[PDB]
Ligand binder design. Structure first.
Ligand SMILES: [Zn+2]
Ligand SMILES: [Zn+2]
Ligand SMILES: [Zn+2]
Lengths: 65, 46, 33, 134, 266
């Protein structure tokens, strides 16, 4: 269900960090807690933002017309 | 150039009217959607 | 030999097509996995 | 925020916090009459009956339906139907008076009895506002 | 120099940790607010949709397009559509982007902040360029599409501020602390045994003189020195988020005088 452009609570964009984050994960094999930090996501508001998103859309796409 | 309907599976434009049933050319799958409007719709962006 | 009416089937039961189908199989049937 | 009511961050409501989609679907058929008499999915006008509806019919195409992009509201007519009886007594379906939104997906088909079966679906986004529950 | 004063510690393209001192909590705060809510900016505020075979809904997509930060340097030289004289809008008060995507690939095709193509004349001025800080140079993933999914829009950015809506805030977040060694006694730490042991000390304690038990309570005390850290989203240069803030707040107090004059006439 797509990555939230900008964090609800404070405002920092987060629209881009998705792919990055999903990468420092399966490739660079880091642990979430850090990956986020690498991505500049300090305070937990913006932090819970990425760490919790469920990118449903990927399933949504697996449909058809 | 201009369309009226579409098929659920074989997403293929149709266009009909009364009498010619409500099926499709090839696969029966007698559903069919109704393709967007020509007069584009506008949205607030908030 | 003779037909005696219709018996409503339960989804995901043996007699139901979905019983066998797989992910991709389903997504194609438009059924949420 | 007293007595079980809360204060919500408006800013957050804007950045998309707690918004949701809402769909709704009106349905309809073309009734048959044993010794051949049927209804019609069309956009009527007077023509004897006057049995119309207060709301606008204009958002209606000629198949007696609305194009998936059209925005509806008050009691606009979503479906056009008529019944002949002894010339045009109405049978059209208008959008639920309270609601409003945007047509999302109109579907045309036939039922077992070769009946013209149609299903419309209007879509809306609902935003957390003062009276809402959480 | 003269009055209130800064001591910018750290600093960058997205932050300005500084030390505004010799002011009034009151005034520090006001500045703090204005930065968050009343600095003009350019944001997408209208979206016509010609086509959308996306898995997302029209307004779903629009919501985000408005969230996408846009270049607002010369924003102060673009008028508010409300003020402009054009029946509706024009290049004198609005930027018009375009967006189009097609599932060309045989594998999930993305759509990015970058894909917006300005189409109105910018009468030469920094405005409406989708702000990108993303490594690959894409910025904000608007949405994705499968096989033959399409999407044809048209956006119209207009001026605007945070009050009217959040997408106009260039703020993002704003750190603010003062009197790290509870001296003014503007608090009362909760505790189980020792307040001091139980409550973390802030990095700001260093930049300031410790307590010294013996000493009596200083009632004449007052709040000076505020350790603030003004982030930014990019729509505007961190430094500017501060100046333009100081500047707006300034205009605000201004009008009060001005109006307080047009009144004198009678
Ligand atoms: Zn945040
Ligand atoms: Zn077909
Ligand atoms: Zn204008």
């Amino acid at each position: 269900m797509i990555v939230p452009v900008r964090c609800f609570s404070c405002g920092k964009v987060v629209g881009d960090k998705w792919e990055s984050y999903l990468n420092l994960l399966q490739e660079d094999e880091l642990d979430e807690g850090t990956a986020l930090s690498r991505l500049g996501l300090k305070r937990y508001c913006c932090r819970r933002m990425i760490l919790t998103h469920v990118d449903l859309i990927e399933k949504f796409l697996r449909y058809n017309p | 150039a201009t369309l009226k309907y579409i098929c659920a599976e074989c997403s293929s434009k149709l266009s009909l009217s009364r009498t010619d049933a409500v099926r499709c050319k090839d696969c029966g799958h007698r559903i069919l959607l109704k393709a967007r409007t020509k007069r584009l719709v506008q949205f607030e962006a908030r | 030999k003779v037909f005696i009416g219709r018996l409503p089937i339960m989804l995901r039961s043996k007699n139901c097509y979905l019983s066998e189908a797989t992910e991709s199989d389903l997504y194609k049937l438009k059924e949420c996995p | 925020n007293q007595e079980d009511s809360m204060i919500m961050n408006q800013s957050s409501i804007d950045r998309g916090l707690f918004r949701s989609l809402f769909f709704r679907s009106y349905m309809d058929q073309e009734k048959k009459y044993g010794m051949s008499i049927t209804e019609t999915f069309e956009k009527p006008q007077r023509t004897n009956t006057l049995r119309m509806k207060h709301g606008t019919y204009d958002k209606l195409d000629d198949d007696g339906l609305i194009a998936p992009g059209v925005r509806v509201s008050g009691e606009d007519v979503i479906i056009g139907k008529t019944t002949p009886i002894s010339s045009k007594r109405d049978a059209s379906t208008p959008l639920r008076s309270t609601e409003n939104g945007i047509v999302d997906q109109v579907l045309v088909t036939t039922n077992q009895d070769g009946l013209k079966f149609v299903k419309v679906r209007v879509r809306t986004t609902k935003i957390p506002q003062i009276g809402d529950k959480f | 120099e003269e009055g209130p004063q800064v001591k910018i510690r750290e600093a960058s393209k997205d932050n300005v940790d500084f030390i505004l001192s010799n002011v009034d909590l009151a005034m520090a705060n006001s500045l703090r607010r204005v930065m968050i809510a009343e600095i003009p900016t350019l944001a997408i505020d209208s979206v016509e949709v010609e086509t959308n075979t996306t898995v997302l809904a029209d307004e779903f997509i629009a919501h985000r397009l408005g969230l996408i930060p846009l270049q607002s340097m010369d924003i102060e030289q673009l008028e508010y559509s409300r003020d402009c004289f054009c029946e509706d809008h024009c290049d004198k008060c609005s930027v018009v982007l375009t967006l189009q995507a097609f599932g060309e690939s045989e594998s999930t095709t993305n759509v990015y902040s970058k894909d917006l193509v300005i189409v109105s004349n910018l009468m030469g001025r920094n405005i409406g360029h989708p702000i990108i800080q993303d490594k690959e140079g894409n910025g904000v993933l608007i949405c994705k599409l499968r096989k033959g999914q399409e999407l044809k829009l048209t956006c119209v950015a207009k001026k605007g501020i945070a009050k009217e809506h959040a997408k106009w805030g260039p703020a993002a977040a704003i750190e603010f602390e003062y009197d790290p060694w509870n001296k003014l006694k503007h608090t009362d730490y909760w505790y189980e045994q020792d307040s001091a042991k139980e409550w973390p000390q802030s990095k700001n304690c260093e930049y300031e003189d410790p307590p010294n038990e013996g000493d009596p309570f200083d009632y004449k005390a007052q709040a000076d020195t505020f350790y603030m850290n003004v982030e930014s989203v990019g729509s505007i240069p961190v430094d500017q988020v501060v100046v333009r803030g100081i500047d707006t707040l300034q205009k605000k107090v201004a009008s009060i005088l001005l109006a307080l004059t047009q009144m004198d006439q009678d």
